[PDB]
Design a protein around this ligand. Sequence first.
Ligand SMILES: C[C@H](C(=O)N1CCC[C@H](C(N)=O)C1)c1ccn[nH]1
Ligand SMILES: [Zn+2]
Length: 138
Amino acid sequence: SGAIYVGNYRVVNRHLATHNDWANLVWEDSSRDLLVSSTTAQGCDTIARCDCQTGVYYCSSRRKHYPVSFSKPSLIFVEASEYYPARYQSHLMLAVGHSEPGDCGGILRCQHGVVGIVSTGGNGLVGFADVRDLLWLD
Ligand SMILES: C[C@H](C(=O)N1CCC[C@H](C(N)=O)C1)c1ccn[nH]1
Ligand SMILES: [Zn+2]
């Protein structure tokens, strides 16, 4: 679990969005595994606007942060799950690291701010849904 709180927006994994997220929907994209809902309280997270390919992510299944080198956002084939059929997930960045299903939502950050959230895992890999291109979040 986990979300990004920026301005009047909450960014979550679309497959973990709650009934309240869908009732306050701003934007969603199944191909990116992202959903953004509106909030009444002001969020104070900062979104990075950069081309970093290194950062640190939070892994809830280890209660630890890990440094990672990750690929640029791209279209990656993701196997079928209970949430989606087999498909290409866009704007996805991969790194070598630990990620179990409940780790989705963990933030990846660089020195500029929030880069994205954990969205995929298994096999000693961790995949992050990029949010740096969503300029409207600010
Ligand atoms: C194995 C699982 C996973 O990659 N998916 C299931 C949950 C939905 C994911 C998606 N983005 O399509 C894919 C996962 C998450 C985090 N660590 N391991
Ligand atoms: Zn950066």
